[PDB]
Antibody, heavy 213, light 213 residues
Framework: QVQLVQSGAEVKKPGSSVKVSCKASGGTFSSYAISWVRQAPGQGLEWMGGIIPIFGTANYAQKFQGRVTITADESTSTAYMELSSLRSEDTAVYYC????????????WGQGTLVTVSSASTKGPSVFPLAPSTAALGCLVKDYFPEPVTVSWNSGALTSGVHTFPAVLQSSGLYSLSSVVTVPSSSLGTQTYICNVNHKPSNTKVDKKVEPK | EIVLTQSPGTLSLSPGERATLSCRAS???????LAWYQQKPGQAPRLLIYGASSRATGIPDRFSGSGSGTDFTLTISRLEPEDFAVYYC?????????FGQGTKVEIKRTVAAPSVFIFPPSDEQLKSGTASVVCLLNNFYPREAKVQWKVDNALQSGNSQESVTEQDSKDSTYSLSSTLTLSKADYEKHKVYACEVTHQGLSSPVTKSFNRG
C-alpha cells in the first residue's frame, strides 16, 4: 500500500516545457519501476517512458524521444516527467504508475495531471440561458479557459435530471459547454431555476437565472 | 513497433453475463508479455492481468486471460455492476510499449428514441456578436445517432460541434448536444434553423426547427 501523489495541473504556451512531479511514500520494495502514461481527451492510452530510479535505467518512446526526460530524486521517492518543445497535440492528462514485486504485479497510480497546451490565455466564461421549450431548459457556458468548470443547479438543490455535457474546443482556442435539465412543465412560471457556474482557474463564479423570454 | 487492436469497439451486456474481449497484435510478443487494464470515466487505469494470463493481487475470481503470441483474450465470467468500463490491452515486449484503442463494456438496454429539443440563441449572446443554436438529443439508446443542421434547406457541416454524455446510471441512456455557431451577421441573413436527427429508435428522421424572431 503506497500513496502516489502527482503535482497540480498546469497550462503552458506552445514551444515551452513542463515538469510533472510524482511523490511516492510507503511500500518496502525499494527496487520499483516508474511508468509515465498520457491520455489526450477522448483518445486512448499512450506510453511515454519508464524509469527504474534505483538502477538509474530509463527507456523512452519512439514518438517523443528527445522531447522527454524522466528523472528521479531517490531521497524523496519523487519521480519526474519533463516534456519540452510543446505543441497543441500534447494537451492531456498525465499519469505516473509504480510497479512493485518481482513480476510488477502491484499496481499503483497517481491521480493524474492535466496539461493544457494553448496560445490563448486564462479567461472567464459567459453564461447564456437556453430558454425552456415535462419541459427542457439549460445554460450555455461559452468561451472559457482553461478546463475545468463546474455546473450545479440551485446550489445543488436540483440534481435530478441534470445533464452537463463534456466541453468542446472552439477554433478560438476557448472551451464551450452546455448544461441541461428536464423539469416539470407546470413548475415553469412558478419555480426558480438558476445555474451556478464555477470556474476555479480564472477565479470566477457566475449565477444565471433561466426563465421563459 | 507493435500495434494492438481490440474487438469489438463497444460491448453491450447486462449484469451476470459473460464478457469476451480480444486483442489482435501485428507481431509476436515475448512468449506472453501482454497486460490488461480497466478504466472508469475520469480515473486512473487499473492493472488486472499480467503475462497474458495472471491475475494481479486483489483482482476478483471472474477475471482471466488467455492466448499468447499474437492473439489474446480477456474474460469476465459473470458481470458485476462495477465491471462496466473501458478495457485496454497493452504489450510490454518491445519498445515503444504500446496500448490498444480499448473496448467499452456498457449496459445493454431496450432501444429508446431521443427527445429532440432546439434552443435559439439568447438575447444576451446576440448583443456580443455571435449566435449559438443548441440542438439537444435526450435520453436515447444506443449511442449511435446523427445530427444534420439545415439553414433554409442548405445542409450544414463544419460550423457545428457536438458532445455526448457517459451512459446514465439511472436509465442506461445517453444524451448528445450539438451547437451550431455562427456570427450575428450570418444568423440574420437567414430564416429557418432546422435540426435533423437520425437515431435508430425512429422510423424516419425527426426535424426540430424555428423561424428567427
Amino acid at each position: 500500500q503506497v500513496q502516489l501523489v502527482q503535482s497540480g495541473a498546469e497550462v503552458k504556451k506552445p514551444g515551452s516545457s513542463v515538469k510533472v512531479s510524482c511523490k511516492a511514500s510507503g511500500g518496502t520494495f525499494s527496487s520499483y519501476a516508474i511508468s509515465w502514461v498520457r491520455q489526450a481527451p477522448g483518445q486512448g492510452l499512450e506510453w511515454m517512458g519508464g524509469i527504474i530510479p534505483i538502477f538509474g535505467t530509463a527507456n523512452y518512446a519512439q514518438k517523443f524521444q528527445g522531447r522527454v526526460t524522466i528523472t528521479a530524486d531517490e531521497s524523496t521517492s519523487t519521480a519526474y516527467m519533463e516534456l519540452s518543445s510543446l505543441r497543441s497535440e500534447d494537451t492531456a492528462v498525465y499519469y505516473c504508475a509504480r510497479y512493485d514485486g518481482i513480476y510488477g504485479e502491484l499496481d499503483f497510480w497517481g491521480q493524474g495531471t492535466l496539461v493544457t497546451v494553448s496560445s490563448a490565455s486564462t479567461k472567464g466564461p459567459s453564461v447564456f440561458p437556453l430558454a425552456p421549450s415535462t419541459a427542457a431548459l439549460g445554460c450555455l457556458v461559452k468561451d472559457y479557459f482553461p478546463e475545468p468548470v463546474t455546473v450545479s443547479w440551485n446550489s445543488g438543490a436540483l440534481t435530478s435530471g441534470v445533464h452537463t455535457f463534456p466541453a468542446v474546443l472552439q477554433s478560438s482556442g476557448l472551451y464551450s459547454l452546455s448544461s441541461v435539465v428536464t423539469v416539470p412543465s407546470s413548475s415553469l412560471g412558478t419555480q426558480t431555476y438558476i445555474c451556478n457556474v464555477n470556474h476555479k482557474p480564472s477565479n470566477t463564479k457566475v449565477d444565471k437565472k433561466v426563465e421563459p423570454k | 513497433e507493435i500495434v494492438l487492436t481490440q474487438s469489438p469497439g463497444t460491448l453491450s451486456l447486462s449484469p451476470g453475463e459473460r464478457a469476451t474481449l480480444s486483442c489482435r497484435a501485428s507481431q509476436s510478443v515475448s512468449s506472453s508479455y501482454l497486460a490488461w487494464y480497466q478504466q472508469k470515466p475520469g480515473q486512473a487505469p487499473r492493472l488486472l492481468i499480467y503475462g497474458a494470463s495472471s491475475r494481479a493481487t486483489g483482482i476478483p475470481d471472474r477475471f482471466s486471460g488467455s492466448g499468447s503470441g499474437t492473439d489474446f483474450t480477456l474474460t469476465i465470467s459473470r458481470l458485476e455492476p462495477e465491471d462496466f468500463a473501458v478495457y485496454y490491452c497493452q504489450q510490454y515486449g518491445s519498445s515503444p510499449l504500446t496500448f490498444g484503442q480499448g473496448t467499452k463494456v456498457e449496459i445493454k438496454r431496450t432501444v429508446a428514441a431521443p427527445s429532440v429539443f432546439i434552443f435559439p440563441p439568447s438575447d444576451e449572446q446576440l448583443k456580443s456578436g455571435t449566435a449559438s443554436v443548441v440542438c439537444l438529443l435526450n435520453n436515447f439508446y444506443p449511442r449511435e445517432a446523427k445530427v444534420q443542421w439545415k439553414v433554409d434547406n442548405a445542409l450544414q457541416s463544419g460550423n457545428s460541434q457536438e458532445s455526448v454524455t457517459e451512459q446514465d446510471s439511472k436509465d442506461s441512456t445517453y444524451s448528445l448536444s450539438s451547437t451550431l455557431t455562427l456570427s450575428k451577421a450570418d444568423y440574420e441573413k437567414h430564416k429557418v434553423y432546422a435540426c435533423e436527427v437520425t437515431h435508430q429508435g425512429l422510423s424516419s428522421p425527426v426535424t426540430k426547427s424555428f423561424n428567427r424572431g
